[PDB]
Ligand binder design. Sequence first.
Ligand SMILES: *[C@@H]1O[C@H](CO)[C@@H](O)[C@H](O)[C@H]1NC(C)=O
Ligand SMILES: *[C@@H]1O[C@H](CO)[C@@H](O)[C@H](O)[C@H]1NC(C)=O
Ligand SMILES: *[C@@H]1O[C@H](CO)[C@@H](O)[C@H](O)[C@H]1NC(C)=O
Ligand SMILES: *[C@@H]1O[C@H](CO)[C@@H](O)[C@H](O)[C@H]1NC(C)=O
Lengths: 391, 235
Amino acid sequence: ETPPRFTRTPVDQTGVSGGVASFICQATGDPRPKIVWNKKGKKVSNQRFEVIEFDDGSGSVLRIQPLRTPRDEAIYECVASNNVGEISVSTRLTVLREDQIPRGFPTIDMGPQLKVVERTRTATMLCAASGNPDPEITWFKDFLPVDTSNNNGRIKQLRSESIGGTPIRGALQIEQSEESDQGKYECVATNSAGTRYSAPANLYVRELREVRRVPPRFSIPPTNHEIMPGGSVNITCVAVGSPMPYVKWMLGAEDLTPEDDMPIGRNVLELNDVRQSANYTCVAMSTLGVIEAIAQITVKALPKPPGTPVVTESTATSITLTWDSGNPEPVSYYIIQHKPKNSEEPYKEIDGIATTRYSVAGLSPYSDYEFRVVAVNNIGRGPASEPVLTQ
Amino acid sequence: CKIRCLCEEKENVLNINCENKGFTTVSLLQPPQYRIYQLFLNGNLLTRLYPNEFVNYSNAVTLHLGNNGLQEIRPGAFSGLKTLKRLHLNNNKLEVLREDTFLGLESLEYLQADYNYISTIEAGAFSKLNKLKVLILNDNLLLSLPSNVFRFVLLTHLDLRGNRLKVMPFAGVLEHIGGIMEIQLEENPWNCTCDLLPLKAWLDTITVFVGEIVCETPFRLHGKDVTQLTRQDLC
Ligand SMILES: *[C@@H]1O[C@H](CO)[C@@H](O)[C@H](O)[C@H]1NC(C)=O
Ligand SMILES: *[C@@H]1O[C@H](CO)[C@@H](O)[C@H](O)[C@H]1NC(C)=O
Ligand SMILES: *[C@@H]1O[C@H](CO)[C@@H](O)[C@H](O)[C@H]1NC(C)=O
Ligand SMILES: *[C@@H]1O[C@H](CO)[C@@H](O)[C@H](O)[C@H]1NC(C)=O
């Protein structure tokens, strides 16, 4: 066991009526000491005097607000005790009227302001104070003094350095803010003439907002088209992301979209009187990259006339026909035309012959006939073939 | 307090944590009546708030209503929140701020309503909220701001980031601002034409300003920070 020992003793204060005065006291020992505040050996008890303990339990701050004069003018004592011992220290409070405030007494020219900081961001409370002599600035939070002794810590106080024709600047800098940093801050200016408090300023801690950046993405990638010669078509391109991406159309190297008139997030290319096939690139760009996607325009030509049919197998009531497609492009299917030779009527048609061979059945015996071949794909019905005569 | 909710006696006030308990209504729990406290109600599925639903929370300092999927606040819901100071409404589904929505409060100085899908605020919404000093509305759907919204308050912090703002006029909206310490306009679709000049000008007259305002429109001015820009670059 060890008796109590002060690590922080209170100092005489001269404050201004209506204002605040605070006395700070801290002690150590084993067991941990308690602290009481007295006046003339009787424990203080007054609506305007509040005692606020340190969370660690080491000390207490006696705060008086609003100051009254001569009421509050007095000697007060901090007494630290345990079962091993007791120690006390005296201190004086003086309170001046505003009409007897001296020239030079510190003034608060500008005080800390309501501030909202995102968690983990830096918050700076500010104070501008002046006086004669030029005063020192200290800080209280939720009625307890701010500790910034450790220059090497999260909360730092900054210099001015030398003012001057204006007031002295004090800064309270709180890096890596957390919920516990939230609270009511006051800046305090002190010189040999006395002590003055700022108005209070609250600090709020808002949850960190993370700028959602998203690289561009083809929301509606252009889809390929095939059409007949001239020939119009509207191909649409859509990009998304943060920031929103500009969308231009290109024909290989050339830009189609004029530069100074270039839409955001959506560009529909209007193509008119299409002549030949074309690869068409669509480029979306943000500050976070450049992406491109092609659109396959093609011009399909409905079938050429098929290559003349040939008679491979002929029976009394059937005639087998083998031909060539007569086409470069895939022929989806073939339609065979048939009628009598001296007949002067529309050709009878057999449909859906998916191959280049087919046996026309049902014919009369010893009867002549004239045959033709008509090609079909997706686009349209190609012209017939040069006819074959047979029996 | 304790049965369907967790209460931590904080050093100064009382912390009541009814977070994420899937309450659809505030009918069930009896708050304390004479003790000052904070109430966390995040992660509770209530579609709507009903008129005078809150009445017995005379003394509640802060109230959190985030991640609740809120859709509407029927006229004058916060009827009894006499001494409320801080309010959160984040991450819900609110599209309109009716003028009579915040009927109850006289004492509130903080309002957070981020991520909420608000397309159109009404003018008289924040009227009769004198004490309000902080307004947070980022990541919403604000295309335009009804004039004289801020004429009756003098807030110091206004967050309008991540909204859908292209222009901001001096007449009405802006002349009331200027008393602010901080303002945020960071992630907005700013269309930098001569029609965006007032804002620009107002940004020189305003003091203690920090943040970037990059031109979304047009392509020529893409990325350029308006503050760096000039009146001739704009005309
Ligand atoms: C392309 O879009 C324009 C714009 O309305 C329209 O007038 C035209 O008919 C469209 N053409 C096609 C082939 O879709
Ligand atoms: C278009 O591009 C494809 C490859 O994606 C290529 O095979 C084709 O020959 C090109 N055609 C034209 C007309 O550019
Ligand atoms: C509030 O308390 C009063 C007291 O009688 C009661 O009648 C009323 O139903 C309560 N309302 C709510 C929402 O708790
Ligand atoms: C940008 O402003 C110009 C003129 O100020 C206007 O013509 C144009 O439509 C605007 N663009 C957008 C996307 O608001």
